[PDB]
Amino acid sequence: MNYKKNLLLLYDRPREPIFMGKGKSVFDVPDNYLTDRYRPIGPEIQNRFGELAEERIPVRSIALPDLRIPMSLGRQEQFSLFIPRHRKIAARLIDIFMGMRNIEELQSCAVFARDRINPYLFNYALSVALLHRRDTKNLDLPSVVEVFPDKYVDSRVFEQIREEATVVPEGMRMPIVIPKDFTASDLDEEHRLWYFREDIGVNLHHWHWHLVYPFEASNRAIVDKDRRGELFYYMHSQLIARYNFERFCNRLQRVKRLNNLREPIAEGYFPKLDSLVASRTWPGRVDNAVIKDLNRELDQIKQDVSDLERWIDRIYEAVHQGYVVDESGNRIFLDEEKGID
Amino acid sequence: MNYKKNLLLLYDRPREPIFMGKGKSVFDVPDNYLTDRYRPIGPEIQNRFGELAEERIPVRSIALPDLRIPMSLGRQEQFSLFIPRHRKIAARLIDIFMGMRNIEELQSCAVFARDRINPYLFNYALSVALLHRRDTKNLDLPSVVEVFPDKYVDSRVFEQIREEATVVPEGMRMPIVIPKDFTASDLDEEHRLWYFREDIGVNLHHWHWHLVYPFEASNRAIVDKDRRGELFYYMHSQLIARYNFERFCNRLQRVKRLNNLREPIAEGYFPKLDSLVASRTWPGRVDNAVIKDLNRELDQIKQDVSDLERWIDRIYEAVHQGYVVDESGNRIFLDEEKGID
Ligand SMILES: [Cu+2]
Ligand SMILES: [Cu+2]
């Protein structure tokens, strides 16, 4: 039906309020769906863009579960599925969208939530729901480059795109060249691998692989894909094989592993990205930075380097022993078939 | 009987020989009870200190176990129950006092030993014996501040107390003020917690807790007290809770743990104590001191930092595993009830 196509409009202009109109459509957002910032001037807004729209999508007012947890993450904050706390927030939101059985209420829940939660988070939570519901199948989700270009492009272009779009009329607009080999000069021999590390393509492949094979997800059905463990091994293993190949093609040696975490990291990297959602830039890492014990009270991270080292020591032991031990105390054997998985 | 009250006289003036007379009494010691240095002129002494005594306590000459081990520790040496070797010495002396199963024989053994063994050690060994024998029970032991003030007071006062006591007649003596907040200036923010760290009260509580609940003794008796493991956890756990409270009341943050033993220790501490028994002062620790492998041949300490690290790694493993392993190889489960203990 149309509904499938109407959800795709949520991906349009993630930080523009949902009442501003996406593509050749606009949402008829109720007056109690406007945010506390915008609700007190709903009258002037609803009928700012009210004429110039071909379609007008109605939206039914429903109950809407408590969105406290989803809204705990700030709007101008970064996301990340690696951070323990974000995992609990996303997995909870995924659960909400997933838990609205009807495809019309999913549209209503979404439209409300969209302007209250972190764009990056919203995009993820929706993407996961759509991809793994039965009514929303074979639906072609817009490339995350197109919705979040800030994660894929030198920040320098943004003020050029703003200039070009404001000054020059449509049709006469010049294509904006995206800088390549821009993160480091030739003093850093690592800069040669820009065409691989910083290639849009491979970064998209990595992001998407983790979409379809998450490692944490309410319901152990979508996490439990056939041989996803072996997949995780192999896919990442092929990344380095391909990387090591490209290294040899740039007069470099094979990549050296992180033998031990106490020794400095020789190769720094300043990525030159500016998050328009966080309105900040991503921090760089300096040459010879050292790993340090984390205490990020807000993010719910309390981990020491020795914890990491302890995990490694134990995993090595299991691998050499040839078996692991489950919570229960039983032994499971790392055989030829399922061992790697 | 009197005997109970006569043992309390041993705690009086620990370094003054037992024949010098304690309170308004004096002991009538055999000549084979006199110490090797004083015995060859002994008679000239019994007479010299006989004066100003109301009572004379007789003491019968008994068998006396070998006091080789008790006498191994120097008289002018420090005594700590943490040092492996001292544990074996004290536990042996405790065994002697404990082994005399009548209150008269205990008095004789004590009177002999007192001037041959380390005062600090004697005090401990006696304290433990009296507190846990049947005939000597509910006896009020003199405060260890009163018997060993050197462990509780700035060394500066001692030469004032000596001056005051020698110059000024009794009755006209001014009370000696004990310096507070004397270990560090305001450049060290840690100095604010003097009223807790250096308070007489809390230091006495800690000392006494370890008196009644040692971790090393003989058999289970006098170590095997209900839930002493949980007690050890909780008591010490409350010390830090209370400390962390007092920190917040002095505009400081929560105490940071010793993550790892290889990194320097930022906070030094010079305690300003002078052991009158050792006739030396306690050493200080400088800022950014580093833990180093011990090789104290005398004390019987041959321990590497890695040994400590290895113990920690194993304990963590057990805690996560959820069970420990006994000497025999069997598994014991850290359940909700007895796990902590
Ligand atoms: Cu990955
Ligand atoms: Cu203690």
Task: Explain the overall architecture.
Chains A, B: Cu(2+) 1 binds at residues 206, 210, 236. Chains A, B: One of its GO terms (cellular component) is extracellular region. Chains A, B: GO terms for molecular function: catechol oxidase activity; metal ion binding; tyrosinase activity. The structure is cut from a larger assembly and holds two copies of chain A (341 residues). By secondary structure, the first copy, chain A, is mainly alpha-helical. Chain A is 37% helix and 5% strand. The first copy, chain A, contains twelve helices and six strands. Chain A has helices spanning 2-7, 42-46, 68-72, 84-99, 103-113, 119-131, 144-147, 158-167, 194-197, 200-212, 228-248, 305-321, and strands at 27-28, 57-58, 294-296, 301-303, 323-325, 331-333. The first copy, chain A, has a two-stranded parallel ribbon with strand order 1-2. Chain A has a two-stranded antiparallel ribbon with strand order 3-4. Chain A has a two-stranded antiparallel ribbon with strand order 5-6. In chain A, helix 4 (84-99) packs across helix 6. Chain A is globular, with a radius of gyration of 23 Å. The interface between A and B is small, with 10 and 9 residues. The complex binds copper (II) ion (2 copies). One copper (II) ion (CU) is lined by residues 206, 210, 236 of chain B.
